[PDB]
Paper text:
To test this hypothesis for HER4 complexes, we determined the cryo-EM structures of full-length HER4 homodimers bound to NRG1β or BTC. In both structures, HER4 kinase domains were bound to afatinib to enable high-resolution reconstruction in the ECD module (3.4 Å for NRG1β, and 3.7 Å for BTC). We present here the first cryo-EM reconstructions of both the homodimer and heterodimer complexes of the HER4 receptor in its full-length form, bound to two different high-affinity HER4 cognate growth factors, NRG1β and BTC. This is also the first time that a betacellulin growth factor has been resolved bound to a HER receptor. The HER4/NRG1β and HER4/BTC homodimers adopt overall similar conformations, but our reconstructions show differences in the intermonomer angles that are adopted by NRG1β- vs BTC-bound homodimers. The two receptors in the HER4/NRG1β dimer adopt an angle of 37 degrees compared to 33 degrees for HER4/BTC. Detailed 3D classification analysis revealed substantial scissor-like movements around the dimerization arm in both data sets with the concerted intermonomer movement of domains I and IV, varying from 35 to 39 degrees for HER4/NRG1β and 30–35 degrees for HER4/BTC. In the HER4/NRG1β pocket, HER4 K438, K35, E112 and D376 form salt bridges with NRG1β E215, D219, R207 and R220, respectively. In the HER4/BTC pocket, HER4 D376 also engages an equivalent BTC R103, but the other three residues are substituted with hydrophobic/polar residues in BTC (NRG1β E215=BTC G98, NRG1β D219=BTC A102, NRG1β R207=BTC T90). Thus, substitutions into small, apolar residues in BTC result in a more ‘compressed’ ligand-binding pocket in HER4/BTC homodimers than in HER4/NRG1β homodimers, which may allosterically determine different intermonomer angles via modulation of dimerization arm positioning. Eight of them are resolved in the cryo-EM maps of both HER4/NRG1β and HER4/BTC homodimers that enabled the building of core glycan trees up to 5 sugar moieties (shown for HER4 /NRG1β).
Human Epidermal growth factor Receptor 4 (HER4 or ERBB4) carries out essential functions in the development and maintenance of the cardiovascular and nervous systems. HER4 activation is regulated by a diverse group of extracellular ligands including the neuregulin (NRG) family and betacellulin (BTC), which promote HER4 homodimerization or heterodimerization with other HER receptors. Important cardiovascular functions of HER4 are exerted via heterodimerization with its close homolog and orphan receptor, HER2. Here, we report cryo-EM structures of near full-length HER2/HER4 heterodimers and full-length HER4 homodimers bound to NRG1β and BTC.
Residue numbers in the entry:
A (entry chain C), D (entry chain D): 64 to 111
B (entry chain A): 26 to 179, 182 to 597, 604 to 634
C (entry chain B): 26 to 179, 182 to 595, 604 to 635
Write the structure that this text describes.
């Protein structure tokens, strides 16, 4: 795909989700656990 | 005009692609102006995106990334304002929109009459299957078009040849979908943008993106302000300067400035200041109400201490109360903006090295009576079973809402009771309380006593069952009324019958019994003046305030009052064997025993 | 630009036609903006009017009447603003400019650059030698051209057409002297005025004259504010409204509005309010000074007795203090605008049935501490020899000036002394005191000491000779310093060499002599606490205010001070009246610190 | 000339000066005495 495992300085980047590292933009993003939203998955989703 | 708030996910997503598409529908379906970003990410190769065609203006950035669909149906988007940029650099960013192993991806951008970007860069890159994107003359759309400044246009091969009816710069492969130049074709005498190559084709200075005609009433987007169908630099004010008299004189057509618009009156949650509607008054002035209108004027030498909330003032960058910013609230009675508690605030943040809050620091909020925004609690220390640290809160102001909500609690397992005591008003927005699996007394509350209008609603779901809480004896004091209660205490019910003594509800008052004596009315009881002698064995002592309204005093009687010594101060007086004062000859200040000077000591 | 004030004489004139001409040179020579009316009346046919070529803007109306001269050289006049109108109707009135038994009068108008008249009508009537003005089309020049406005030209034998290149509409016989149309020839796409018939030839909307291009900085004249070369409806204020945060935020480009211009600083005598520089504030606000800047804030339950002067507020229509308006000043302490005393105000005005002021009525001004404008005295009751009715006046503001003057006293023969006491500052403008042939304290005053800038001057052309005043003994009290004196009394001196007891100057103070006692301060002496012993032979017993400052008193001496009686914690006192604490359990009496010392 | 004797209602129109009436415009014109100026000659002249 377009991403790999997060570099060590990002170990705790995402909260209540799984971190992924976008190689072409050198930028982390996260896939959130059920019911969570926001850039680091740190907020609860009201639409759930 | 239909307005929607947008998102702040950047490149993050939900755990399922079907939930990610449904969310995109819920945020952006049936709206035309976005009060934030447009973020379209991870959408599959075969989805209906035709709902995005109603978007005409975006306040923040437009991000299109990691998708697989063939056509981007942004068919009415004219202007991007760029008030927030992707990575603080780009107003439009389109990248990586293809499947790596397969043959799906974005082929045509759409973007029918996109004509203006008012701020930031433009980034179009890594989009494997786009045909026309690299032929577009983006410097006509972008202000400060200087190509060395964040204008990073890339990205494909085997396509990009224009239809014979469009002289290069095509959006698509047909007679339509041709880029129209609005700035680079104008006369050297021209201000802003034009609708043709001549000076007579130039449009008014406060229009953006081009025009139907030359007028401020006849164009495709305003910039600065929309004065009721005309684009303007500012709106007419309450006073004007008269250059011949050297004084300020009252205007006849004044309007209050409000967002990008101008109005005849400010909404009831905004403060009027200097011919504008503002969310908060500056700390140098007191907010007051005059003739039902909120406004502000300079305060007296001692005045209320108000803190910045989360997302405003000195805390503009904060997401939550945490161990670093919580010390700012020590003597505040009012908070301007929001009060928010996220998991990063309560339990710390190991990525940014922010420490968890010591549960004892949260007692710092016991002085606050008003919050002007919303209350948002998503995390709370496990050993704090109630909200007694907020017991003195009176009003939730609701001047700003979190997705329409003003009181919001989710997923608190370590709670049994709420225990608010002073809370009487929730002025705007909805109440949302869910997933509180150990919370009991919530089910008793009469929420129409806290709501300020019939248009307010509450959502309750998946909390502890009321039938299980009743079975366990989770009930309030026997005096508590049908309005319900915050917690088990005799002072934690919304309203009660019989009488109360401050916050505590009581069965009876000290009229003829106990250590002191008082009088009662309207479920309230307060002490009469301590000069009144306490009556015993069921006899009533007091039936009103003061040294008046009682059976008798232990002091010397003097009209409606009593005194420690009858001749004190004073005309002059002496007292009889029942301690009632009667006239004496004047002077005699050493003491008197009767009506005349012969009775003086 | 060179700015001058205009006259307001209408058709009235001086008795001598040479003085009429010399007066006209002195008001209008070497200035380009006339801050009032331009009025040219009764000028002889042999006079030089070339000094009028400097005039470009008139803020009021232009009046040209009853004159003998052939040509009116206003070729570069551009705009008439119409702030006031002649007979309340006309911004330009030209009439009767000929002699009917002879052959002299006005022939050719000049006026080539006249482009905009912002308010009022146009009135050209009953001239004899003026032939070309019938051809001119005023509706291009007049801002309100419709038939409901009084725009009219009334007759001569004629003077042909000016040149073959001029299609009528012309002032004199050349291709140089025909009218530039600026409104009636403009394309229907354009609002305001144009510099040619095409849309590409239109001016910027916020301009009044002709233009070199469609820009706010490239037009000849405008009807609004001048923001550093740009003509604009409003200029940048102290705060700008942020449309995404919904708050007012500070503006680093802010400018103050001042008259018709946008400026960075407001002059020291003006008060700043709401991003503008103004003469006075609303009755709901008080003037305060913070960081050396005067500004206004909402006033509390007690507000200053702000009062309307002559020419402002409820008295804007008034020319003088008089018997119909003098009652409005009875409880006034700060006057906004001027106090002006003319012949009609003092001696009456039978034309309007207004009676003379009864001299006693002038005492309503005894309470005035500040005048924000100017003081102008040209008449006073013959029964008064001084101005002591103003003795409490402290400051003359000078926010408005009378031809540059802020204090003006003309032709008062009854006055022998001025007798001000409280006047310490004249914040702006010059002083002009003349023809007071009986006044003897004008030359002893150190007038530079009342000024608040090096640019202020005093003019004294003639009063009573200093040698005659000296011969009569018209000098101030011996205690008075070199700064001079308002009148003969020791209290009317500007500043005294020895100490003053309030307003009264004295040789020596009651430090150690007399029935009351005082302490020294830097130029004054002030009484001590009455408990303190009145010792002889140089023994001053106090060093400032209060019963704590006394070295020895006839009353009780407690810890911090002398008192008439000590408290009942309860205190007792020794045979020297020195007070000490009693046992706590005392109410009726005590003679010592312990329980057996307490008395009942 | 252009001037006539002032009508009775203008008797006290001029102060320190002589009244004339401008017939064509039915309006007074006041001629001021030594050192006086103004529409009714009511003010003293600062130049003389
Ligand atoms: C690309 O750019 C174009 C402009 O080049 C944008 O066009 C806008 O499209 C909307 C419709 O989606 C237009 O709104 C409609 O305009 C009609 C215009 O009618 C004539 O009269 C005007 C008079 O000024 C002329 O300018 C015009 O050329 C026409 O000759 C109206 O008739 C419509 O109103 C009627 O229909 C509705 C139906 O619900 C009724 O409610 C009304 O009562 C009425 O009967 C309507 O107003 C809009 O005017 C266009 N704007 C511009 C700037 O021209 C596109 O949005 C943009 N994108 C795409 C996908 O094309
Ligand atoms: C300056 O500010 C003014 C407001 O002060 C803005 O006005 C908006 O004008 C646009 C059109 O240019 C409006 O949008 C469309 O209006 C159609 C007509 O209905 C409106 O008008 C009637 C009265 O004439 C009202 O009764 C009615 O409530 C509407 O307000 C509608 O048919 C359109 O809606 C349809 O399409 C959308 C998708 O595009 C669907 O979501 C709808 O369900 C529906 O099918 C649409 O509403 C707009 O409403 C006006 N706003 C306001 C507040 O009046 C100017 O646009 C603005 N100018 C600039 C340059 O910014
Ligand atoms: C939140 O707001 C509260 C007030 O509502 C602030 O609390 C006050 O803080 C001040 C700080 O100066 C305290 O003043 C100091 O108090 C000391 C203790 O006084 C108490 O105990 C004595 C015991 O005899 C009592 O007499 C007295 O009434 C108090 O109950 C004094 O020892 C201090 O005196 C010393 O300092 C002063 C400085 O000027 C010197 O003049 C003295 O000579 C001496 O050296 C001083 O008086 C005050 O007591 C506090 N009040 C309360 C109610 O607790 C918080 O600080 C504020 N928080 C924040 C973060 O802003
Ligand atoms: C002992 O306990 C008794 C109650 O048992 C208390 O009595 C109250 O006394 C106050 C005055 O101190 C009363 O208030 C005044 O009432 C006047 C009469 O009007 C009322 O009564 C008539 C009866 O027919 C009704 O029709 C009418 O609607 C009212 O209810 C008013 O005239 C007074 O207001 C006017 O005068 C004041 C003057 O300052 C102005 O400020 C006002 O603007 C207004 O013009 C005033 O309202 C009160 O009514 C008494 N209550 C009862 C229940 O009788 C005693 O006060 C208490 N002892 C002590 C020491 O406080
Ligand atoms: C009636 O109205 C017209 C139009 O407003 C006035 O026209 C002005 O004419 C004067 C004299 O020519 C101009 O003043 C001079 O401008 C020079 C700059 O060039 C101008 O002309 C070119 C085209 O030829 C334009 O491109 C350019 O923008 C300018 O407009 C300056 O260099 C001159 O300064 C020098 O001379 C003066 C003389 O006093 C010295 O003090 C200086 O130190 C310096 O050496 C001078 O400023 C003026 O600019 C014209 N205005 C306009 C807007 O065109 C008429 O003057 C007026 N009628 C009468 C009778 O005055
Ligand atoms: C907005 O406000 C500005 C000023 O705040 C106005 O511009 C001023 O206009 C006046 C009148 O033209 C200028 O006054 C002249 O000062 C000259 C000084 O020389 C300098 O400035 C001129 C600019 O005109 C330059 O050409 C020159 O190189 C110098 O830098 C004097 O020499 C002038 O005296 C001569 O001309 C006058 C014309 O009035 C004749 O009557 C005299 O006889 C003499 O020959 C003259 O006094 C002033 O300097 C300008 N200030 C500047 C430069 O900003 C704008 O006009 C105003 N905008 C509007 C129209 O609203
Ligand atoms: C008879 O009464 C007179 C007064 O009429 C007494 O005189 C005292 O004189 C001394 C000087 O000799 C005064 O002390 C000085 O006062 C200055 C002003 O302080 C006031 O104003 C400021 C304004 O912001 C306030 O902040 C402040 O609280 C006061 O209200 C101070 O600036 C001086 O401080 C400097 O000097 C001292 C010297 O020890 C240093 O310690 C300081 O760091 C600083 O450098 C100084 O305090 C005093 O105020 C006068 N007192 C009175 C009552 O006014 C006589 O003493 C009195 N005689 C008898 C017999 O009692
Ligand atoms: C929650 O609190 C609300 C607000 O106090 C209570 O609503 C009140 O309901 C009563 C009973 O229905 C209403 O009184 C009745 O009104 C009708 C009006 O036609 C009248 O005919 C009856 O005689 C009687 O007066 C009352 O108006 C209403 N108040 C409001 C503001 O709507 C409600 O009872 C509370 N619920 C509980 C169970 O605590
Ligand atoms: C006996 O009843 C009286 C009322 O009759 C109770 O006291 C008074 O209650 C009224 C409201 O019913 C209070 O009026 C309000 O005061 C606030 C002051 O900020 C004002 O904002 C409101 O607009 C309104 O005027 C009144 O203050 C109050 N008086 C006192 C002294 O508390 C009383 O509590 C009852 N019980 C007993 C035993 O006294
Ligand atoms: C009249 O009032 C003026 C203005 O207040 C007084 O003028 C002042 O004269 C003093 C004389 O001492 C000047 O102070 C200094 O004098 C010394 C002399 O050695 C010199 O070295 C210093 O440079 C300084 O000038 C003071 O500056 C000056 N003030 C002004 C505004 O010029 C004048 O004394 C008063 N009385 C009389 C009798 O004129
Ligand atoms: C001894 O004489 C000096 C003057 O040489 C006196 O000084 C004056 O003190 C007064 C005190 O009120 C100062 O007044 C000021 O008024 C403003 C009003 O807004 C207030 O904000 C200030 O805090 C201040 O009180 C005045 O400026 C000052 N004058 C000078 C020239 O310094 C002093 O009072 C005399 N002492 C005795 C014991 O009489
Ligand atoms: C001040 O007013 C008084 C009147 O109050 C004038 O005194 C009068 O002078 C006339 C002169 O012919 C005498 O006949 C009167 O008897 C005087 N009256 C009194 C009451 O003495 C006095 O002349 C006035 N002074 C000035 C300068 O006008
Ligand atoms: C209610 O109690 C029953 C036992 O009486 C239990 O089975 C059930 O799980 C309880 N429900 C909740 C919500 O605790
Ligand atoms: C000065 O006094 C003399 C008499 O000593 C007198 O003749 C002369 O007129 C006086 N001058 C003035 C100015 O009054």
């Amino acid at each position: 795909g377009h991403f790999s495992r997060c570099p060590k300085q990002y170990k705790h980047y995402c909260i209540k989700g799984r971190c992924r590292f976008v190689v072409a933009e050198q930028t982390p993003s996260c896939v959130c656990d059920e019911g969570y939203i926001g850039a680091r998955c740190e907020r609860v989703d009201l639409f759930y | 005009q239909s307005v929607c708030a947008g998102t702040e996910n950047k490149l993050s997503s939900l755990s399922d692609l079907e939930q990610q598409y449904r969310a995109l529908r819920k945020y952006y379906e049936n709206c035309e102006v976005v009060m934030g970003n447009l973020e379209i990410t991870s959408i599959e190769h075969n989805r209906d995106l035709s709902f995005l065609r109603s978007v005409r203006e975006v306040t923040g950035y437009v991000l299109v990334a990691l998708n697989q669909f063939r056509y981007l149906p942004l068919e009415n988007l004219r202007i991007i304002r760029g008030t927030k940029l992707y990575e603080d650099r780009y107003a439009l960013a389109i990248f990586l929109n293809y499947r790596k192993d397969g043959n799906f991806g974005l082929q045509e951008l759409g973007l029918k009459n996109l004509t203006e970007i008012l701020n930031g860069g433009v980034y179009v890159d890594q989009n494997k299957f786009l045909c026309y994107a690299d032929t577009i003359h983006w410097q006509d759309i972008v202000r400060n078009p200087w190509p060395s400044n964040l204008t990073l246009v890339s990205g494909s091969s085997g396509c990009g040849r224009c239809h014979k009816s469009c002289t290069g710069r095509c959006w698509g492969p047909t007679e339509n979908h041709c880029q129209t130049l609005t700035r680079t074709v104008c006369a050297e005498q021209c201000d802003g943008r034009c609708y043709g190559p001549y000076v007579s084709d130039c449009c008014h200075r406060e229009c953006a993106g081009g025009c139907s005609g030359p007028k401020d009433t006849d164009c495709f987007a305003c910039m600065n302000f929309n004065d009721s169908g005309a684009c303007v630099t500012q709106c007419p004010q309450t006073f004007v300067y008269n250059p011949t008299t050297f004084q300020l004189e009252h205007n006849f057509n004044a309007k209050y400035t409000y967002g990008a618009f101008c109005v005849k009156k400010c909404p009831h949650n905004f403060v009027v200041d200097s011919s504008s509607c503002v969310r908060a008054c500056p700390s140098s002035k007191m907010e007051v109400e005059e003739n039902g209108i909120k406004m502000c004027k300079p305060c007296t030498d001692i005045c209320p201490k108000a803190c910045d909330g989360i997302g405003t003032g000195s805390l503009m960058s904060a997401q939550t109360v945490d161990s670093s910013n919580i010390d700012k609230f020590i003597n505040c009675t009012k908070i301007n903006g929001n009060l928010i508690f996220l998991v990063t605030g309560i339990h710390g943040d190991p990525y940014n090295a922010i420490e968890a809050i010591d549960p004892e620091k949260l007692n710092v909020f016991r002085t606050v009576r008003e919050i002007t925004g919303f209350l948002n609690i998503q995390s709370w220390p496990p050993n704090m079973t109630d909200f007694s640290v907020f017991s003195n809160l009176v009003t939730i102001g609701g001047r700003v809402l979190y997705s329409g909500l003003s009181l919001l609690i989710l997923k608190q397992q370590g709670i049994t009771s709420l225990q608010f005591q002073s809370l009487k008003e929730i002025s705007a927005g909805n109440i949302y309380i869910t997933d509180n699996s150990n919370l009991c007394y919530y089910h008793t509350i009469n929420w129409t006593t806290l709501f300020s209008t019939i248009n307010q609603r509450i959502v309750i779901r998946d909390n502890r069952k009321a039938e299980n809480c009743t079975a366990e004896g989770m009930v309030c004091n026997h005096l508590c009324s049908s309005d319900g209660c915050w917690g088990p205490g005799p002072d934690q019910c919304l309203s009660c019958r019989r009488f109360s003594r401050g916050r505590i509800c009581i069965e009876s008052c000290n009229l003829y019994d106990g250590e002191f004596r008082e009088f009662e009315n309207g479920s309230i009881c307060v002490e009469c003046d301590p000069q009144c002698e306490k009556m015993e064995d069921g006899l009533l002592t007091c039936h009103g305030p003061g040294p008046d309204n009682c059976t008798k005093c232990s002091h010397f009687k003097d009209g409606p009052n009593c005194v420690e010594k009858c001749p004190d101060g004073l005309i002059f007086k002496y007292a009889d064997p029942d301690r009632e004062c009667h006239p004496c000859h004047p002077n005699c200040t050493q003491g008197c025993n009767g009506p005349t000077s012969h009775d003086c000591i």
